[PDB]
RNA sequence: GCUUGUGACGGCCCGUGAAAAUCCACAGGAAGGAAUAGUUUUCAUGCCAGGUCGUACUGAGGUCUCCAAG
RNA sequence: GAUGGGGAAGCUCCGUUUCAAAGGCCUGAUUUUAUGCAGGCCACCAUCGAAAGGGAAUCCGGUUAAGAUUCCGGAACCUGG
């Protein structure tokens, strides 16, 4: 009831009734046909293409990462010594002396 | 604001109708019969609508469809042409002559109130040639007369004469005098 | 991409704006009619 | 060639604004919309909205140029002009004081007919029956309306007459397949020349008319659907069935004014049309009759009401917590059984439908993938994320139904 | 150097230096714009089309005009 | 130099925005005594008059007895959709 009309999924509250005699006369019935009538001659009609497909056929066919080893997974060496943020790095061509 | 040519002309003619001093044979009009007496004149005059072209056609085909296969009094109606009304006054057959105040050439109906006062015909200058037109199947009529009458309406007509004599002719005895239109 | 051709009504705009507007207009003409009734009884 | 002006060619002569359509026709907006309702003309959406305008981004509705350009020469427009002439020439007669000539103007009055307007709209009969879906929804609503100063009694009586003609035919040639009783009303489905029409009938209670709704738009829709239904019903009756229009018994219309009245003279394929044959139902006072006796007579049963009083009877339909008589001869049912027998077609057992117990739920007849996201373009990432959200908003609602079913089943 | 094009200056006037078609720009803030293609194409690439009439030659006291080797 | 006006017995002359109703666009749930159209925006004036004035965009090579920025080959550009 807080949501504005016409941007609403149901035009009604769903209700339970034990007896068929206990079914009320639905008050907002003239409103529904009137709004449909207005929807016929005032609402613009467009030819659309509804993309009836699975989401799975949008991911490109790419090889699974397991057949493209090796690649790094987890961390091993944590360098704790700084009081300031490590902005830059550099490695020697030989492969031991890591500068920060 | 800027108005059209004809609009300016009829507005200028309206103010010209007021602001000029006018001869007393005119402005003997516009000193006209009031609302109650006008409504009461027409409550009688509406009972004598001349039989409209459709009504006359259907009735005279009813005469043909009946009388050709297998007494009436003369019917009374209002009398409505200027040639015929000024004929009827001077006959003298007119008991109530109704005169329009608004006529296209004013010069047409200027003799008529005073000729009615001359002949002794009880006249009333009523307001609107359109309003006279309505009771007579015409757009406009300028004049409407009531010669003869049914006896049911006779006493009402005689009283309509006496009411118009008292209301119109007695209140407007000063109107034969006095040049109208001296409004500042 | 296996798309189904169909027709689509776009949502008629200002539907809620005019709805509330007509809701108000109807009530206003009711009240004005009532005011006419009273003022005619003063005649 | 000389350099052509820009915004006068492609989408500028393909479409026109509402204002430009109204002006071109030299017709009032109301009458423009009246013709638009009759002809079945609607605004259309261009690929460029601003090229369809003369450059402007503006709130504008575009009609098809050749559609309006085709509306211009039409008998209905000319007859609207004739109604306008008649209107002033009547008030001339009335306003003066002459009544006889005005009464004569009524006699010498012809009106516009919506005959040729359907031939150009629905050229084939199966196409008209594809529209009758929306046509029967207005008409059955307008039957269940109190007459106001907006809508005359003659309008509602003629609409109800067509409704009763429709109900009589569908119950005559036995063309029902599905029923669905909702809060809104009662839905039906009908193989009318084998194309399955659907239509809604409200419950027979007084309907609160809002002052919000416009009973001038709805009256023209009624005016088009009404004539459309007259021609449909003539075609149906004169093809496979009966004389049109059928008569109505006066002392039958005095009793019911529904469907057991209005007798119709002449001069199966589906299991639903073969059901209830050699069954006689005694409909009680408590149930609505006109929504139920249609279904009994459609399938092949027979109706005797409590209402008609104000034998062969094998079933009674009663909606009371305490039932009084209880004979051995009859079988006692709450109408839900009928509303399930039509849907299935297989004659559901009446053990779950006794008077005094709760009815059945009454169903309608209607990791690596997150890693392979990367190699998609933006024109594919936007679409894939949208399809993921659309499936998510469905599945979570399905989870809501499951969680609510579990929370209720405990109680 | 001659021909011609262009740039910055400086004089000469209270003489202050044609018009319109056409094209662009600014101020303005109306309106519009999303979850099985949101709104916007003054960005890039791609498609189609462009009617009528004149058009040859001469043009040298005796109409106008352009190009101009040593 | 028409039109509006005004002359002139007239052939026609005066006059060029003049005391012309000179028109072309937008807004709307369809306009509340029930389906007859309401409200707003703008205020000068047809047209002709330049092959030397303003103006979108084409060059090179080739080709005939006689045609070329027009034809051919190549390579371009502009305008509108």
From Swiss-Prot, chain A:
Which stretches does the entry tag as region Required for interaction with YTM1?
Answer: 29-65
PTM annotation (Phosphoserine): residues: 64
Protein origin, superkingdom = Eukaryota
Instruction: Report the locations given in the UniProt record.
Output: Nucleus, Nucleolus; Nucleus, Nucleoplasm
Enumerate the transmembrane spans.
Answer: none
- Other remarks in the entry: Present with 2680 molecules/cell in log phase SD medium.
Similarity comment: family membership? Belongs to the WD repeat BOP1/ERB1 family.
Q: How does it assemble?
A: Component of the NOP7 complex, composed of ERB1, NOP7 and YTM1. The complex is held together by ERB1, which interacts with NOP7 via its N-terminal domain and with YTM1 via a high-affinity interaction between the seven-bladed beta-propeller domains of the 2 proteins. The NOP7 complex associates with the 66S pre-ribosome. Also interacts with NOG1.
General function of this protein: Component of the NOP7 complex, which is required for maturation of the 25S and 5.8S ribosomal RNAs and formation of the 60S ribosome.
Its recorded name reads Ribosome biogenesis protein ERB1
Q: Which organism is it from?
A: Saccharomyces cerevisiae (strain ATCC 204508 / S288c)
Q: Which gene encodes it?
A: ERB1
Shown segment, full-protein numbering: 355 to 454 of 807
Curated annotation (Swiss-Prot), chain B:
Entry annotated with the keyword Chloroplast:
no
Where would you find this protein in the cell?
Cytoplasm
Keyword annotations for this protein, in alphabetical order, are:
Cytoplasm, Ribonucleoprotein, Ribosomal protein
What are the coiled-coil residue ranges? none
Give GO MF terms, alphabetically.
Answer: RNA binding; structural constituent of ribosome
GO cellular component assignments: cytosol; cytosolic large ribosomal subunit
Entry keyword annotation includes Ribosomal protein: yes
Q: What is its main location?
A: cytoplasm
Q: Tell me, what is an example of a GO biological process annotation in this record?
A: maturation of LSU-rRNA
- Which residue ranges run through the membrane? none
**Its biological purpose:** Component of the ribosome, a large ribonucleoprotein complex responsible for the synthesis of proteins in the cell. The small ribosomal subunit (SSU) binds messenger RNAs (mRNAs) and translates the encoded message by selecting cognate aminoacyl-transfer RNA (tRNA) molecules. The large subunit (LSU) contains the ribosomal catalytic site termed the peptidyl transferase center (PTC), which catalyzes the formation of peptide bonds, thereby polymerizing the amino acids delivered by tRNAs into a polypeptide chain.
Q: How does it assemble?
A: Component of the large ribosomal subunit (LSU). Mature yeast ribosomes consist of a small (40S) and a large (60S) subunit. The 40S small subunit contains 1 molecule of ribosomal RNA (18S rRNA) and 33 different proteins (encoded by 57 genes). The large 60S subunit contains 3 rRNA molecules (25S, 5.8S and 5S rRNA) and 46 different proteins (encoded by 81 genes).
Q: What else is known?
A: Present with 238000 molecules/cell in log phase SD medium. There are 2 genes for eL8 in yeast.
Per the record, the similarity remark reads:
Belongs to the eukaryotic ribosomal protein eL8 family.
**UniProt protein name:** Large ribosomal subunit protein eL8A
UniProtKB/Swiss-Prot annotation, chain C:
The protein's name is Ribosome biogenesis protein RLP7
Q: Which residues carry this modification: Phosphoserine?
A: 3
Q: What else is known?
A: Present with 7720 molecules/cell in log phase SD medium.
Where do the record's region annotations for Disordered lie? 1-41
Q: What family does the database annotate?
A: Belongs to the universal ribosomal protein uL30 family.
Where in the cell is the protein located?
Nucleus, Nucleolus
Bias (Basic and acidic residues) occurs at: 15-34
Intact protein stretch covered? 12 to 54 of 322
Q: What is the lineage of its organism?
A: Eukaryota, Fungi, Dikarya, Ascomycota, Saccharomycotina
Swiss-Prot record, chain D:
**Gene3D superfamilies attached to this UniProt entry:** BRCT domain (3.40.50.10190)
Q: What else is known?
A: Present with 4530 molecules/cell in log phase SD medium.
Per the record, the major location class is nucleus
**UniProt function note:** Component of the NOP7 complex, which is required for maturation of the 25S and 5.8S ribosomal RNAs and formation of the 60S ribosome.
Organism of origin = Saccharomyces cerevisiae (strain ATCC 204508 / S288c)
The gene from which this protein is expressed is NOP7
Q: Which Pfam families match?
A: BRCT_2, Pescadillo_N
* Bias (Basic residues): 379-388, 402-411
Gene Ontology cellular-component terms listed: nucleolus; nucleoplasm; nucleus; PeBoW complex; preribosome, large subunit precursor
Localization per record: Nucleus, Nucleolus; Nucleus, Nucleoplasm
Q: Where is this region: Sufficient for interaction with ERB1?
A: 51-366
* Protein name as catalogued: Pescadillo homolog
The record's note on quaternary structure and interaction partners says: Component of the NOP7 complex, composed of ERB1, NOP7 and YTM1. The complex is held together by ERB1, which interacts with NOP7 via its N-terminal domain and with YTM1 via a high-affinity interaction between the seven-bladed beta-propeller domains of the 2 proteins. The NOP7 complex associates with the 66S pre-ribosome. Also interacts with NOG1. May also associate with the origin recognition complex (ORC complex).
- List the InterPro entries: BRCT_dom, BRCT_dom_sf, PES
Biased composition annotated in UniProt, kind: Basic and acidic residues: 392-401
**What does the UniProt keyword field contain?**
Coiled coil, Nucleus, Phosphoprotein, Ribosome biogenesis, rRNA processing
Conditions for induction: Expression is down-regulated prior to the diauxic shift.
Inactivation phenotype: Essential gene. Reduced assembly of 60S ribosomes and accumulation of halfmer polyribosomes.
Family, as annotated: Belongs to the pescadillo family.
Organism ancestry: Eukaryota, Fungi, Dikarya, Ascomycota, Saccharomycotina
| A single GO molecular function term of this UniProt record | RNA binding
- Domain BRCT: where? 271-355
């Amino acid at each position: 009831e807080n949501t504005e009309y016409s941007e609403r999924e149901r035009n009604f509250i769903p209700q339970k009734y034990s007896a068929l005699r206990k079914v009320p006369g639905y008050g907002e019935s003239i409103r529904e046909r009137f709004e449909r009538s207005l929807d016929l001659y005032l609402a613009p009609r467009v030819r659309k293409n509804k993309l009836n497909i699975d989401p799975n056929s949008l991911i490109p066919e790419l090889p699974s990462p397991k057949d493209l080893r090796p690649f790094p997974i987890r961390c091993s060496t944590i360098y704790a010594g700084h009081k300031g943020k490590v902005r830059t790095l550099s490695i020697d061509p030989s492969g031991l002396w890591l500068a920060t | 604001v800027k108005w059209p040519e004809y609009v300016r002309v009829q507005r200028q003619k309206k103010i010209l109708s007021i602001r000029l001093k006018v001869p007393p044979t005119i402005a003997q009009f516009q000193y006209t019969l009031d609302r109650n007496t006008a409504a009461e004149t027409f409550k009688l005059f509406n009972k004598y609508r001349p039989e409209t072209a459709a009504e006359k056609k259907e009735r005279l085909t009813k005469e043909a469809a009946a009388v050709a296969e297998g007494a009436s009094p003369k019917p009374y109606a209002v009398k409505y042409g200027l040639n015929h009304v000024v004929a009827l006054i001077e006959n003298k057959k007119a008991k109530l002559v109704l005169i329009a105040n608004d006529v296209d050439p004013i010069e047409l109906v200027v003799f008529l109130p005073a000729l009615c006062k001359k002949m002794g015909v009880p006249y009333a200058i009523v307001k609107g040639k359109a309003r006279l037109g309505t009771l007579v199947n015409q757009k406009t009529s300028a004049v409407a007369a009531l010669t003869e009458v049914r006896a049911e309406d006779e006493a009402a007509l005689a009283k309509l004469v006496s009411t118009i004599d008292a209301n119109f002719a007695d209140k407007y005895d000063e109107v034969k005098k006095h040049w109208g239109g001296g409004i500042l | 991409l296996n798309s189904n051709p169909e027709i689509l009504l776009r949502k008629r705009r200002n539907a809620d704006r005019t709805r509330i507007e007509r809701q108000e207009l109807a009530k206003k003409k009711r009240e004005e009619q009532i005011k006419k009734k009273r003022s005619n009884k003063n005649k | 060639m000389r350099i052509k002006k820009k915004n006068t060619r492609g989408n500028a002569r393909n479409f026109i604004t509402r204002s430009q359509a109204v002006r071109k026709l030299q017709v009032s907006l109301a009458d423009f919309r009246r013709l638009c309702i009759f002809k079945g003309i609607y605004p259309r959406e261009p690929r460029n909205k601003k090229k369809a305008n003369k450059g402007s981004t503006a709130p504008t509705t575009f009609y098809y140029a050749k559609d309006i350009q085709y509306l211009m020469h039409e008998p209905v427009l000319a007859k609207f002009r004739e109604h306008k002439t008649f209107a002033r020439k009547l008030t001339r007669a009335l306003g003066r004081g002459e009544v006889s000539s005005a009464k004569r103007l009524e006699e010498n009055r012809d009106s516009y007919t919506l005959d040729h307007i359907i031939k150009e709209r629905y050229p084939s009969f199966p196409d008209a029956i594809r529209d009758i879906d929306d046509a029967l929804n207005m008409l059955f609503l307008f039957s269940n309306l109190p007459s106001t100063n907006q809508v005359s009694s003659k309008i509602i009586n003629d609409a109800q007459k067509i409704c009763n003609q429709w109900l009589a035919y569908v119950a005559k040639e036995r063309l029902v397949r599905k029923v669905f009783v909702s809060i809104k009303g009662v839905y039906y489905q009908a193989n009318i020349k084998g194309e399955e029409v659907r239509w809604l009938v409200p419950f027979k209670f007084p309907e609160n008319i809002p002052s919000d709704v416009d009973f001038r738009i709805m009256l023209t829709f009624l005016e088009f659907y009404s004539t459309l239904l007259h021609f449909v019903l003539y075609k149906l009756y004169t093809d496979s069935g009966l004389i049109y229009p059928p008569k109505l018994d006066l002392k039958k219309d005095k009793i019911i004014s529904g469907l057991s009245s209005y007798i119709l003279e002449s001069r199966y394929d589906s299991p639903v049309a073969s059901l209830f044959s050699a069954f006689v139902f005694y409909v009680s006072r408590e149930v609505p009759i006109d929504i139920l006796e249609f279904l009994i007579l459609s399938c092949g049963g027979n109706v005797i009401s409590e209402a008609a009083m104000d034998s062969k009877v094998t079933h009674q339909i009663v909606d009371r917590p305490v039932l009084k008589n209880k004979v051995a001869g009859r079988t006692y049912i709450q109408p839900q059984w009928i509303f399930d027998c039509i849907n299935k077609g297989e004659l559901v057992p009446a053990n779950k439908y006794l008077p005094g117990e709760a009815l059945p739920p009454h169903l309608s007849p209607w990791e690596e993938k997150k890693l392979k996201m990367i190699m998609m373009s933006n024109k594919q990432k936007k679409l894939y994320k949208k399809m993921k959200y659309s499936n998510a908003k469905k599945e979570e609602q399905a989870e809501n139904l499951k969680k609510k079913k579990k929370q209720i089943a405990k109680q």
